[PDB]
Symmetry: D3
Subunit: 153 residues, 6 copies
């Protein structure tokens, strides 16, 4: 696994409304992942329906899209070794009832329809979601001063 | 699972003595559950014996009742969807040696006889414990300003 | 100054609504003060008008009483040396615009009409407010295990 | 002082490198101010020279511009009553040696050339800095669920 | 079973460099374990090869020893019931990829070659490492003021 | 002015007993100062009377020395620009009654005889106390990975 793997993490409107932007960012920051893109956005319905295109037949699809439209979203790209899988572990189970304390949803969420955050489920879906939400010039290239202390190689 | 389920959470005398009232309250508060009743109490011996009536024949019963009388207790009623089961998850395993870091006992406790907190183990036992520790007038009815961001309509 | 001085600290309805019960309690807990009484209450208008009786001629009186009635209040009695004066310093300036970061209002509040918390301004007013909000049996007598490490005598 | 006043807050490259994005955001988030715009950026040299145009003749100007180009910047717009003046108070004194513990620089910074953050010093300079760093479409209009608990009607 | 059990916990050079001494000590402090010895040391290569003598044939041995020499180490001895096994649970899995959020490595580490901390894996090895890193005079004898609230003994 | 200035910071026995080692170290760690020496010690009465030799005629001298002997002490040396003066500002006023929230004593202490911590009051006295508490080999030489982000030098 390469240390330049990237994943798309988004703070959903309930996370923004409930004042969780700082804490959620700190979870990935303290773990050692690198923030390479971030923006507060209120994306159009078409973009949100494309983001959740695989769930278009689910009965909760229209309520999911309407709720994702109901407030601002903090869209982020994080970079690090196995950041996709480990990011999902940091977020916790999709349904917060099954999430463990110490994860984001295990500390902050209750309802699956209000699970505060989103994270890419696979490397290929991460590449697709990053391109959907961000322009290439919005990803910032930099090197952390503690890179050699987080990674062995 | 309705959003008005209630559970009884109590900070035991060792949790009060060790200065854990704030942190324990924050665990439930940050998760999104609603505090509907709270009071610091030094309840009578007969109340603690009735609270632990199911363990009256356990060899540690008299020691448990005497220790629960040795200091103040912060009794609380929390309200939320599946707050009984999720409350037990937040508290962690009864024996802290089996609890996971990130839970209350996994972060703060070591001995099973000093597990710093108590939580109702079922909805029916919650209703019993709420009626034992709180008069009905002590439960406050209110609507959280972020209720519609914690729960899906 | 005696180490058994007591003050009345209350988390106002905006503090409860905004999820600040845990953090505020931790401020007094970590400082070394002793919690001797606490209860979540929704007091009647008559009690709130008597609490603020000295402000009955102020133009903001009726709005203050209505806002104090609009949600639950976490009423507390804290005990410690100079807990009245030091408690006021922990809360910060009445108007949060003049409060310093590191105080409760300096960290959590903006408007003077929504300053999250209340604290007794003098020892004699503290004795009056404690008797107004609490029955004598609601004050719990106990001794902290770290009393001799917080106080020299 | 209306509740829709806006200020420009930016986490400088040293604050990003030292992993302070989360904690700094939480300072404003917990205080009750509304995040209306945010993005991670590596802006052009001419933008940073215009940002610090009032200091073009200071001897540290070229060093300041070069250091502000040495890493990513988290640019933010925060909205709230007196957010410009209170924002400066939260940040602390420009020289961290003169800053007080509890402020951002008083908690995290030492050197004036590495004071981890920037904040607009006046309302008119805030409007200038907002127009320089953000397109108008990047400011998101929304209503905080706890607005009526942060501000008096 | 015995509350006087001791284990060797070390903050590795990557943990010191990334400013994690405070948070790591707090994990064991808040849990209820007693610190009986601590020192910041830069031990010679011969001592580190003794410490990892059982891994002398591993292909990562040379890189491990070099990395352990690259910075200061915070050597500690913690005392408490089952502190060896529980200490390992607090640290998390050796490979942070497999660790859970809420543990030290689950909150702060990514690479197995940079897992921030070390903990004794057995009681016998703990006694061996304590004698290797500490002189017998460096272990301080004291009794915590909250010992009877942490343990039922 | 020089970034290699050093000061002696000690966590007094009341700070150790009340579980404040972690939080206190974090204050200096997060500020950007470098820990160059640390050890948990129980120094003899003769060393403590040397440390407080200028107060030998004070009426509280005997009680101070006895209290400093009543538990372990976490002796530390921190290095950074103006670390002596800024270190005193982080600790807060000698009498916690006069300290401000956000400082160590303003967050954790009440009595002047139990002020949790000690800090050198001048550079010359710092050099004297460092030589009194530490051997020259116990001061570790290293360079922080974020040194160039903390200092403009
Ligand atoms: O059963 C449901 N009812 C309401 N919302 C759901 C339900 N299942 C999933 N969701 C929402 O849709 C989002 C995406 O669902 P998905 O199946 O992709 O899980 P994921 O977010 O962990 O990748 C979830 O995060 C959740 O907010
Ligand atoms: O074996 C024991 N020795 C001493 N105390 C025990 C023991 N087992 C349980 N307890 C204490 O009795 C309390 C109630 O026991 P219970 O079986 O109901 O666990 P619970 O608190 O998770 O519901 C426990 O929280 C614990 O403090
Ligand atoms: O000018 C005002 N407009 C609206 N509310 C005010 C004003 N001044 C004071 N208050 C509110 O009344 C409460 C009590 O006022 P007081 O003068 O006693 O200050 P204090 O709360 O610090 O003791 C204040 O905390 C505040 O909530
Ligand atoms: O004397 C100096 N040497 C190096 N950098 C300085 C000096 N004075 C100010 N700066 C830097 O320039 C920035 C802008 O200067 P200004 O006077 O506007 O303070 P401000 O950031 O509080 O508004 C400061 O934040 C600081 O980073
Ligand atoms: O596969 C590896 N590659 C690089 N370093 C490793 C590897 N496996 C273990 N290590 C490092 O060696 C140290 C000691 O190895 P050990 O097998 O004893 O795990 P432990 O620290 O949990 O007891 C580990 O903490 C880790 O830093
Ligand atoms: O009046 C007093 N009564 C009891 N202890 C005192 C008193 N004044 C100072 N001390 C204690 O002696 C220690 C050293 O006194 P000093 O005057 O040097 O203050 P300092 O620690 O800020 O340098 C103080 O930290 C405090 O613990
Ligand atoms: Mg999906
Ligand atoms: Mg039971
Ligand atoms: Mg008044
Ligand atoms: Mg300026
Ligand atoms: Mg091993
Ligand atoms: Mg002195």
């Amino acid at each position: 696994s390469m240390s330049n793997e990237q994943t798309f993490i988004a703070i959903k409107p309930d996370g923004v409304q409930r004042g969780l932007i700082g804490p959620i960012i700190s979870r990935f920051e303290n773990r050692g992942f690198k923030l390479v893109a971030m923006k507060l956005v209120s994306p159009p319905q078409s973009q949100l329906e494309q983001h959740y295109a695989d769930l278009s037949d689910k009965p909760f699809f229209k309520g999911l899209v309407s709720y994702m439209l109901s407030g601002p979203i903090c869209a982020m790209v994080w970079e690090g070794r196995d950041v996709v899988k480990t990011g999902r572990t940091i977020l916790g189970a999709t349904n917060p009832l099954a999430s463990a304390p110490g994860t984001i949803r295990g500390d902050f969420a209750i309802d699956v329809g209000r699970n505060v955050c989103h994270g890419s489920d696979s490397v290929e879906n991460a590449k697709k979601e990053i391109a959907l939400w961000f322009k290439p010039e919005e990803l910032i290239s930099w090197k952390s001063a503690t890179f050699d202390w987080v990674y062995e190689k």
